[PDB]
RNA sequence: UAGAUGUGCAUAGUUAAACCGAUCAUUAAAAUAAUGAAUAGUGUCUAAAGUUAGACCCGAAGCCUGGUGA
RNA sequence: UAUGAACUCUUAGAGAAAUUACUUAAUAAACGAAGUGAAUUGAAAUAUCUUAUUAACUUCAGGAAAAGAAAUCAAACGAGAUUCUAUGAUUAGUGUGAACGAAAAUAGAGCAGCCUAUUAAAAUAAGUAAAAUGGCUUUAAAGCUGUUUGAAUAUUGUGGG
């Protein structure tokens, strides 16, 4: 999709292909490329359209077109109510564009926004996300808000405080690129 | 009745239409080679 | 002499029972001057009765028992064929509990 | 090359939530405790129950 | 009347944070159309979704859900 | 050493069916009032058979799916 | 029991495979799972049905794969994961018909239990269970599913069957 620029971040919203191309204005030395961890459940082997949006567990379905009198069967299709929407991301502070089903719009309202819909750790959600949602999940995790929120939940669970962030690497490439 | 359809035929068209590369580089060509390989053919193409 | 024969009888039990009793030892076999509150194995601290569901304190969600009702009946059946059924914790699959509930309440 | 493939399968560890990290850490501690052992004192008290319910 | 009707959505529960006029005062809970919350209020940080977790932290319950007050004016 | 274990068929009939039973069914209550139905099975071999499988043998035009060729 | 050598192509790129140009470049079939899914045929025609969760195609994967330690079955007694074979069974049942067709249980092959899984996973599961509607499967249940909606908290009887 055509995504906006994050207000105060050099990392753009990933491409549905999984690539994070950086503008030439961002001085990055070759031998470097942003790599997103692979999606655990792999891509969807059917309905590849679902690998580029937030489709939940919805796919294209096949069945019959039973008639009235003789009940003659004829194959047909059932498509999900997919729509293109701009969804607010409190973490990024912009409108993330993506194709989403109406059932996933309700879940987003149920969990409390798009950011909350991506940070779920249950197995059912990671499957519903898909390759695309896995990228948006990776992106919001690079923000300072989620990094600060997770750092506060680690001490609450009794974990040690928590190497260099990606945003910092792109910052160090500037200071070293000009001189 | 049969016709002389090989009159004026060239061997550049044979290689393009039935040659080895015409088949390893396509999805349906790979099946042809794998079918002929299973049967034991020596001549897999052309 | 008899003490050595007793240890041999216990060591002759199937590994499945020796394992369970090792991590869920009842007060009967504990030392004489022992106390149930202490001497608890790491498993008994997580779940006093592994056959009953437990409500996690932090998260108000019931945790399934460490042994399903099918696996509970297998231990009762295995413990009854070796004479250690009275060493298992409370279970709705115990032969005495199944019978007591039928005689007391009936159909 | 084999080490790069390994690190790739382990790349998602950076995308773990704090709860996921908490549970993965408890296993390392739980697995370290080991299995409780039956003392010869307790094994004897178990044999008394076996013989009592088998012979008398 | 009938024993079965078309299933409709009443709305989403939200708690205001900016004292929106014509809808309610600050910290007011009620059900509002999902479009206004999803497109107007949530982006501008004017309200927040009331999730079951949010209720516990605030100590409130489902009994606090009020109604929209079209007569409210700051 | 001992114990248990492993398809099935028959041994009781009757009715739509159960209760019932050398009797049962219909008779809206029943009753020798009337009518129908009761006594060696089981396993194996040989052979001939019914049924389902290509099913005694040979023979279409055509239909569908996947590939090939300008 | 060790050991020297072991060319070219399939198989860097490109190309008219066994060439070019480079370089210590390299993996068929069958079998598996899911997705999609006919027709011949039978009903003495033919639409439901049957043929048939078949053939075939596509994707992904390993030496096997898949499945798997009960939100399972039973019936007032109890059994105790999955897989393969036989019986149960030309059965219950479905269908106007033609035909289609289980499970419990039994026997045998194997047998293994677990979450601290002998490889590193859960803070015990919510847009889920379930409902209406359109379909699949099917005996009307259960199970799968597009659309629109949408719960509860454990035998001190909460949830599924
Ligand atoms: K598609
Ligand atoms: K009889
Ligand atoms: K029901
Ligand atoms: Mg001609
Ligand atoms: Mg010519
Ligand atoms: Mg509306
Ligand atoms: Mg090549
Ligand atoms: Mg070469
Ligand atoms: Mg006919
Ligand atoms: Mg029948
Ligand atoms: Mg549960
Ligand atoms: Mg459902
Ligand atoms: Mg149903
Ligand atoms: Mg259900």
From Swiss-Prot, chain A:
Extract the GO molecular function terms from the UniProt entry: structural constituent of ribosome
GO annotation, cellular component aspect: mitochondrial large ribosomal subunit
Its primary localisation, in coarse terms, equals: mitochondrion
User: Cellular location of this protein?
Assistant: Mitochondrion
Q: Does the keyword Mitochondrion apply?
A: yes
- Keywords, alphabetical: Mitochondrion, Ribonucleoprotein, Ribosomal protein
> Ligase as a keyword?
no
UniProt lists the family membership as follows: Belongs to the bacterial ribosomal protein bL28 family.
Q: How does it assemble?
A: Component of the mitochondrial large ribosomal subunit (mt-LSU). Mature N.crassa 74S mitochondrial ribosomes consist of a small (37S) and a large (54S) subunit. The 37S small subunit contains a 16S ribosomal RNA (16S mt-rRNA) and 32 different proteins. The 54S large subunit contains a 23S rRNA (23S mt-rRNA) and 42 different proteins.
Q: What does this protein do?
A: Component of the mitochondrial ribosome (mitoribosome), a dedicated translation machinery responsible for the synthesis of mitochondrial genome-encoded proteins, including at least some of the essential transmembrane subunits of the mitochondrial respiratory chain. The mitoribosomes are attached to the mitochondrial inner membrane and translation products are cotranslationally integrated into the membrane.
Q: What is this protein called?
A: Large ribosomal subunit protein bL28m
Species annotation: Neurospora crassa (strain ATCC 24698 / 74-OR23-1A / CBS 708.71 / DSM 1257 / FGSC 987)
From-to range in the entire protein, with total length = 42 to 225 of 274
From Swiss-Prot, chain D:
- State where the protein is found: Mitochondrion
- Top-level taxon: Eukaryota
- The membrane spanning regions, by residue number, are none
Name the family the entry cites.
Answer: Belongs to the universal ribosomal protein uL24 family.
Q: How does it assemble?
A: Component of the mitochondrial large ribosomal subunit (mt-LSU). Mature N.crassa 74S mitochondrial ribosomes consist of a small (37S) and a large (54S) subunit. The 37S small subunit contains a 16S ribosomal RNA (16S mt-rRNA) and 32 different proteins. The 54S large subunit contains a 23S rRNA (23S mt-rRNA) and 42 different proteins. uL24m forms the wall of the exit tunnel.
Q: What does this protein do?
A: Component of the mitochondrial ribosome (mitoribosome), a dedicated translation machinery responsible for the synthesis of mitochondrial genome-encoded proteins, including at least some of the essential transmembrane subunits of the mitochondrial respiratory chain. The mitoribosomes are attached to the mitochondrial inner membrane and translation products are cotranslationally integrated into the membrane.
Q: Please state what the protein is called.
A: Large ribosomal subunit protein uL24m
Species in which this protein is naturally found: Neurospora crassa (strain ATCC 24698 / 74-OR23-1A / CBS 708.71 / DSM 1257 / FGSC 987)
Q: What is the lineage of its organism?
A: Eukaryota, Fungi, Dikarya, Ascomycota, Pezizomycotina
- What gene is behind this protein? mrpl40
UniProtKB/Swiss-Prot annotation, chain E:
State where the protein is found.
Mitochondrion
User: To which protein family does this belong?
Assistant: Belongs to the bacterial ribosomal protein bL9 family.
Function according to Swiss-Prot or TrEMBL: Component of the mitochondrial ribosome (mitoribosome), a dedicated translation machinery responsible for the synthesis of mitochondrial genome-encoded proteins, including at least some of the essential transmembrane subunits of the mitochondrial respiratory chain. The mitoribosomes are attached to the mitochondrial inner membrane and translation products are cotranslationally integrated into the membrane.
How would you summarize the oligomeric state and partners of this protein? Component of the mitochondrial large ribosomal subunit (mt-LSU). Mature N.crassa 74S mitochondrial ribosomes consist of a small (37S) and a large (54S) subunit. The 37S small subunit contains a 16S ribosomal RNA (16S mt-rRNA) and 32 different proteins. The 54S large subunit contains a 23S rRNA (23S mt-rRNA) and 42 different proteins.
Q: What is this protein called?
A: Large ribosomal subunit protein bL9m
User: Which part of the complete protein is shown?
Assistant: 52 to 125 of 300
């Amino acid at each position: 999709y055509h995504q906006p620029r994050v207000p105060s971040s050099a990392i753009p919203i990933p491409n549905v292909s999984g690539r994070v191309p950086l503008p030439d204005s961002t001085p990055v030395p070759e031998d470097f490329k942003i790599e997103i961890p692979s999606y655990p459940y792999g891509p969807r082997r059917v309905y590849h359209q679902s690998n580029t949006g937030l489709y939940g567990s919805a796919l294209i379905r096949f069945g019959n077109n039973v008639s009235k009198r003789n009940e003659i069967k004829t194959r047909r299709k059932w498509r999900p109510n997919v729509q293109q929407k701009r969804l607010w991301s409190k973490s990024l502070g912009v409108f993330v564009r993506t194709r989403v089903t109406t059932r996933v719009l309700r879940t987003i309202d149920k969990v409390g926004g798009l950011d909350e819909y991506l940070l779920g750790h249950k197995a059912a959600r990671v499957k519903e996300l898909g390759p695309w949602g896995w990228m948006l999940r990776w992106r919001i995790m690079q923000t300072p808000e989620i990094r600060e929120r997770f750092a506060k939940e680690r001490e609450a669970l009794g974990l040690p405080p928590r190497e260099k962030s990606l945003e910092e690497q792109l910052r160090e490439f500037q200071v070293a690129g000009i001189q | 009745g049969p016709r002389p359809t090989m009159s004026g035929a060239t061997r550049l068209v044979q290689k393009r239409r039935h040659g080895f590369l015409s088949r390893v580089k396509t999805k349906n060509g790979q099946k042809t080679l794998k079918r002929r390989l299973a049967k034991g053919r020596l001549r897999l193409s052309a | 002499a008899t003490v050595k024969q007793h240890v041999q009888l216990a060591l002759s039990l199937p590994p499945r029972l020796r394992t369970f009793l090792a991590r869920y030892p009842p007060a009967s076999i504990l030392p004489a001057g022992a106390d149930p509150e202490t001497h608890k194995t790491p498993y008994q601290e997580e779940s006093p009765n592994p056959f009953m569901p437990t409500k996690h304190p932090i998260t108000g969600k019931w945790h399934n028992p460490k042994y399903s009702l099918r696996r509970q009946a297998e231990l009762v059946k295995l413990a009854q064929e070796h004479g250690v059924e009275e060493l298992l914790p409370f279970t709705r699959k115990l032969n005495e509990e199944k019978l007591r509930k039928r005689v007391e309440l009936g159909l | 090359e084999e080490q790069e493939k390994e690190a790739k399968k382990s790349a998602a560890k950076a995308m773990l939530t704090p709860v996921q990290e908490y549970n993965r850490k408890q296993r390392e501690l739980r697995r370290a405790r080991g299995q409780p052992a039956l003392t010869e004192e307790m094994l004897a008290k178990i044999g008394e129950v076996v013989a009592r319910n088998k012979l008398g | 009347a009938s024993h079965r009707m078309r299933l409709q959505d009443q709305g989403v529960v939200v708690r205001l944070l900016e004292d929106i006029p014509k809808f309610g005062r600050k910290h007011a809970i009620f059900r509002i159309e999902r479009g206004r919350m999803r497109n107007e209020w949530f982006p501008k940080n004017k309200a927040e979704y009331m999730t079951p977790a949010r209720f516990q932290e605030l100590g409130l319950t489902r009994d606090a859900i009020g109604e929209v007050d079209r007569s409210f004016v700051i």
